Amino acid sequence: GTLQTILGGVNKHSTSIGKIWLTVLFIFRIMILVVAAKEVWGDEQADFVCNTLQPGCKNVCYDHYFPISHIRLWALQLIFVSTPALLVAMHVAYRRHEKEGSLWWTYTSSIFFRVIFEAAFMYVFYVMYDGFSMQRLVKCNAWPCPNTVDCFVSRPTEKTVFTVFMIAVSGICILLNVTELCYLLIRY
Amino acid sequence: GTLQTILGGVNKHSTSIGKIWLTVLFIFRIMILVVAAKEVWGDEQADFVCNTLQPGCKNVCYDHYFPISHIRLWALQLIFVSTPALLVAMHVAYRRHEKEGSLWWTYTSSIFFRVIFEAAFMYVFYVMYDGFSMQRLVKCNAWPCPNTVDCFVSRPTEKTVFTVFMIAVSGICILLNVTELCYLLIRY
Amino acid sequence: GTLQTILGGVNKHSTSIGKIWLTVLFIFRIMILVVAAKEVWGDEQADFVCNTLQPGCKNVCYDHYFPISHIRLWALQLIFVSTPALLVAMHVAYRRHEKEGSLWWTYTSSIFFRVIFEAAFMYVFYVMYDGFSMQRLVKCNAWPCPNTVDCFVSRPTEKTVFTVFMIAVSGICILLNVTELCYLLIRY
Amino acid sequence: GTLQTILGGVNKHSTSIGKIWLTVLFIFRIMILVVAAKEVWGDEQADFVCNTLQPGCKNVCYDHYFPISHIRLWALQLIFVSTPALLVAMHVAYRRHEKEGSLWWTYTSSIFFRVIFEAAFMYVFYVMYDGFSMQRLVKCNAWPCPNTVDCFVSRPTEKTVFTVFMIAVSGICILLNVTELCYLLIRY
Amino acid sequence: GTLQTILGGVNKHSTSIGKIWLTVLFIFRIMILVVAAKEVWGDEQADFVCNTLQPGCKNVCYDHYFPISHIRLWALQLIFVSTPALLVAMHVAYRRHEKEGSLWWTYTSSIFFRVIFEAAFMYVFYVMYDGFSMQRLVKCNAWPCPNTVDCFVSRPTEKTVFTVFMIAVSGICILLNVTELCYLLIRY
Amino acid sequence: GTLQTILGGVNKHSTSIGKIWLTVLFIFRIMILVVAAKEVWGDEQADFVCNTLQPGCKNVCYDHYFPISHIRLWALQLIFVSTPALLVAMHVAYRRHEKEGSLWWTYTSSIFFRVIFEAAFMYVFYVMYDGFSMQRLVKCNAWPCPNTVDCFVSRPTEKTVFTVFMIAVSGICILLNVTELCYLLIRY
Known part of the structure; x- marks a missing residue:
């Protein structure tokens, strides 16, 4: 609906990698999460089976081994890596309404937060689920x-198949952001 | 859909913090409530398990410890903190149709009700759920x-993870509103 | 979607209270009914529990104490209080297509039916559910x-919490309509 | 969405009663069927309870007493009473693309089929469900x-409450169509 | 939504019967399948009851007597009878972008495939379900x-009621296509 | 909604087969997956029945024979065969914003990846499900x-019926891409 229209505006304001590759991989992750992965986890607790007669043992064992579901972790990650772009879009629009370094410092910091959020959630996945x-x-x-x-x-x-998929794409998004940082570093 | 179009209009009429930071955090809370949190609470009563054979004990115990669900409390809070902005949008549009202090008094009062509603719901969360x-x-x-x-x-x-998230963001929204109040206080 | 666009047209054609306060409270009730209240009543019969072994006793007892659900009563009430406004919108548009008293008599009668429908449904709530x-x-x-x-x-x-909420807002809408009647009564 | 936009076009091409009263009652029936009635019938077979141990007796008894559900009958009725209007809209548009009696004969026949379809479905309701x-x-x-x-x-x-509601509105729609016929009969 | 907008374009490019009657019956079938019939078949396997204690007998008996559901057969049929029209729309648009017999041969063949697909699916219904x-x-x-x-x-x-309905409408669509063929045959 | 609007743009930029036949078959596969096939697989695990009393045997046997569901495999395949087209659309738009071989090399490579992705997923279907x-x-x-x-x-x-359908259409899409490659090969 309006999401692709909004993404069109931020598409018109980015760099070579940012306009195309980062935007596509971001949409790539959303499509996987929405149309495919979200219904793999639908019966995560309904079909969790424990060999016991103790009432309440199923509730505590599921909660112990899945403190937060994988799909909820990915939903949070996508929100966190998309807000720095959203801030820039409003910040530029605000600047346009009033009317080099100002945009350069924001844009450089914008890709810096995406790397941090991307790596932080990837780290949480490893330690929490071993x-x-x-x-x-x-x-x-x-x-x-x-x-x-x-x-x-x-x-x-x-x-497991979808977990490997989301982790692999996230790792690629980190590499793309780092290369964009280098291109803005050699510029000096 | 049309929600972002409507939020665009109120975006064009606000102050530095109000245009950007308060609007983003408001959308931040809506996204968490809708796409992630609303299905954590889906089986709140279906998977509530009591170690008893007494008919009706499950109904009264769930009702005793969850008088109103967390997601319903957050849904009410978002509605209450968004109506003062909605009133200003119609009040300004009405003023435009007919055509300093008039807008200043409304805008200052508008951010005053948001602080009260934000703190009131946060207080209810603490006392009700201890x-x-x-x-x-x-x-x-x-x-x-x-x-x-x-x-x-x-x-x-x-x-618990989503409860801490919503409370933390709400506390930040209170601080942003207070700073906006100070900026309009030093103006005199 | 298109609902707010339609409400924009009727917003442009009303009086001081009618343009703003009555319209906001009407949208206020719709939001509560849709996003919050409609899923409180989702398992009204599924989780109705009776201490018996008699087949069919659960069906007749639920039907006896809930002849019509609260949410269905509120859905009917909102439809009935919104049709007089819808009639005026088409009546004015029809008059515009062909092209004081004619609009005055319709508008005055329009707010008269809203008071009757609002009070009638409030009365039904009290007698039916005691x-x-x-x-x-x-x-x-x-x-x-x-x-x-x-x-x-x-x-x-x-x-109970949502019932008190809907009743309180409906009572406020009655008072707003009465004041609008008085403003058009002192005009003479 | 687009439904009200489409209904706007057919609104611009009708007569006094047809433009306003018939269109409103038609939308009135759709709203009741969609937002309220459709979930009263949700558990029609799931909560049908029979006092027996015979396998398959529940299936045959439900099928015997409800050969077609009430909501499916109303869905068919609304489709049948809306197609003559849809035919006229395309027939007029086709005539406009190429470019008294031609439109008069179609319009008069259009309201004639609505009376027949309205009465036929009302008759089916009475005989089938006694x-x-x-x-x-x-x-x-x-x-x-x-x-x-x-x-x-x-x-x-x-x-029963919703059945009486739909029947009462349908009977009113018949009377409105008959009066429209009389107004085009006295014209001669 | 956009479906009626798309159907408007193909409406502007057809013949007397094709513009109006074939298009209406096509929309007639879609409405029945979507708003009414699709939830008659919702519990086709959930409420299939077999008088046995043998594990797996219910699965094999349902699969034996319903190799493909009625609604899935109708969904496939509507797709197959709508693609020849879709091909013509793109073929004409492609011809317009570049810029008698060329359109005549496509249009005549277009209605020829619709008759074949319509009759083939009707034949499958008879033999498969006897x-x-x-x-x-x-x-x-x-x-x-x-x-x-x-x-x-x-x-x-x-x-059975909805099966007779869909078969009857499909048979009418065959007759309309045949008459359109005759009108283009007598032209020579 | 907006999907057909987006597909309209890529429709305006392709070759004879690419504009029409490849686009139609792509939409053909999406319609089958969405409106028909997605609810055949709805109860894949709920109605999986095993003749045993061992707790957990049903979970491990379903996971062993269906490591990834058919519908999830098709969802991934459609995403992978649509991204090379999406990349070209943004790459051309980026080139237009800045402003033979450049577009020729991208377009030729674009249809080369579609053949690889189409064949790879078809191979996975055969080996995984025998x-x-x-x-x-x-x-x-x-x-x-x-x-x-x-x-x-x-x-x-x-x-099985829907599996044969999706495989047959995918094989046709491979042949169409190969012929497009030959037409751009004889050009030299």
């Missing part, structure tokens, strides 16, 4: 589960 | 539950 | 329930 | 149900 | 069902 | 299933 591969079986001993209980994840393989 | 952290286990003794019954919350950790 | 507070427990003795059966309502407290 | 009141209990003896089985309808009272 | 009437009871003896198992269809009568 | 026919019965011996367990697929025949 690698990018999801297991079929999780062993849970949190109260009130008696001793250790076996619980089984829903669609672990398909979730 | 802090911003959701527990795995709630103990319930309301009739008809016999003695005290253990009940287990769905996704307590993910709900 | 006050604006929803109870946790309902006692039901309709056939085929044996003797008297205890049944438990879903989310009674949250439904 | 009045406009829905009962709590239906007795079913179709195979494979043993002897006669008691089955219980979901939300019979709320469905 | 007439246009759906039965309440199906007897199934595919492995792993022991001996012959009784299974019961959901909403057989309502599905 | 042909294009889905079976009613799958035998599963992954841990924790004891010995070998019989499991039954939901709607195997309808999924």
